[PDB]
């Protein structure tokens, strides 16, 4: 349980940082290619 809690907190610190604004600046300007890349990257991060 400690390993689960710690690792999941490390994963969700991604969202917790709130620094997603600089990514979102280009989220206004993504293409379908880029959004597919982000979709894959989310699952890659989960697997990591």
């Amino acid at each position: 349980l400690f390993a689960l809690r710690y690792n999941i907190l490390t994963l969700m610190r991604m969202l917790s940082l709130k620094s997603l604004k600089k990514q979102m600046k280009k989220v206004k300007k993504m293409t379908v290619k880029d959004m597919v890349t982000a979709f894959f990257s989310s699952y890659w991060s989960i697997f990591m």
């Binding site: 379908v32 959004m35 597919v36 979709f39």
Partner: protein, 39 residues
């Protein structure tokens, strides 16, 4: 909406990709049968 479309596609094709992985593994291991060690 596009995220949901991707989700639906992968959920639909989960089993087919599982079969394809086994087929590709058999192909790779068949290729590895012609494998020669060198000095």
């Amino acid at each position: 909406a596009y995220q949901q479309k991707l989700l639906n596609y992968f959920a639909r094709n989960f089993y087919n990709m599982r079969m394809l992985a086994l087929f590709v593994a058999f192909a790779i291991n068949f290729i590895l049968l012609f494998y020669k060690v060198s000095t």
